[PDB]
């Protein structure tokens, strides 16, 4: 279909991948750092979900260099994909209004 939809869908699929990879990689980077809490996979997936959406409750977060980098990748992927859905909707609404007018 139209490019924007292809870009929006693609940057959902990619986001889901980043959530799983970002969840597996955060546990890998954080174990070994005394005091770290992002160390088991289930809560790490929850952590990534609340990071990508930018809600960030503060119940869990990375304390190591690599865990933080992973965090930045998760943030950008989520923000980027949401900005791509908004842009795709605007295109659909704009192109659609050109008709109603």
């Amino acid at each position, epitope marked *: 279909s139209a490019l924007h939809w292809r870009a929006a869908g693609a940057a959902t699929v990619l986001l889901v991948i980043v959530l799983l990879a970002g969840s*597996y990689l955060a*546990v*890998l980077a*954080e*174990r*070994g*750092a*005394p*005091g*770290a*809490q992002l*160390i*088991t*996979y*289930p809560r790490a997936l929850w952590w990534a979900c609340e990071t990508a959406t930018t809600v960030x409750y503060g119940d869990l977060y990375p304390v190591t260099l690599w865990g933080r980098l992973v965090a930045v990748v998760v943030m950008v992927a989520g923000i980027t994909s949401f900005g791509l859905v908004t842009a795709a909707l605007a295109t659909w609404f704009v192109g659609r209004e050109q008709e109603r007018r």
Partner: antibody
């Protein structure tokens, strides 16, 4: 069937080094971590370290002197623990255990009795 | 690193009575506590996970409760096969750590 198989025992001379093994069976996931626990007679469980075979990274108990070195073999599904320059202080039963990345030790090996003596 | 205190070190109960093991953490760890049973010459065996979740194959007699810093492992009506050492283990913060242990002793 026995999920984790370990050799019943190992004799080591003071100052030498031995390598323990832990052959895994049953379901294996990318999120599995293999742990090693040291237990001296009459005492409790002391965590030594862990390793994630799928990636090869390992971590160790900082509170104690580092006598171990962990490695894994994906093809033979075997986790190994190398103990070096031992003394009688290192004589104990060494257990391996499997954790599915969710914090608890679902299953343990029978344990290898290590004795350091000339 | 989180210190897990198990006191008393030995507990004596009469056959059939209700017994309770205590585990105290040096800081709040939610419900990230797990219990293990180790009989004489045996390897540890998972009894209860996440403070209160049951494992399959474990007698209904065993139960756990608590959250935060205080945890309890309970056995409704203890029997001879329950004679063993009991350990708690936390997974809230790295590195995982074990309590020192409580020995269950029965008075017959």
């Amino acid at each position: 069937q026995v999920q984790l198989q370990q050799p019943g025992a190992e004799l080591v001379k003071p100052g030498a080094s031995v390598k323990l093994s832990c052959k895994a069976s049953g379901y294996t996931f990318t999120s599995d971590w293999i742990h090693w626990v040291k237990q001296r007679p009459g005492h409790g469980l002391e965590w030594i370290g862990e390793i994630i075979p799928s990636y090869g990274r390992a971590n160790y108990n900082e509170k104690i002197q580092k006598k171990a070195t962990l490695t894994a073999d994906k093809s033979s599904s075997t986790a190994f623990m190398q103990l070096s320059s031992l003394t009688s202080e290192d004589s104990a039963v060494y257990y391996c255990a499997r954790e599915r990345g969710d914090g608890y030790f679902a299953v343990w090996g029978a344990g290898t009795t290590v004795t350091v003596s000339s | 690193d989180i210190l897990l205190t198990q006191s008393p070190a030995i507990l004596s109960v009469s056959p059939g009575e209700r017994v309770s093991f205590s585990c105290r953490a040096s800081q709040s760890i939610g419900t990230d506590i797990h219990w293990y049973q180790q009989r004489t010459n045996g390897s540890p065996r998972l009894l209860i996970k996440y403070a209160s979740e049951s494992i399959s194959g474990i007698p209904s007699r065993f139960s756990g409760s608590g959250s935060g810093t205080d945890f309890t492992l309970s056995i409704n009506s203890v029997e001879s096969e329950d004679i063993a050492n009991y350990y708690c283990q936390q997974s809230n913060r790295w590195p995982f750590t074990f309590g020192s242990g409580t020995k269950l002793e029965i008075k017959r």
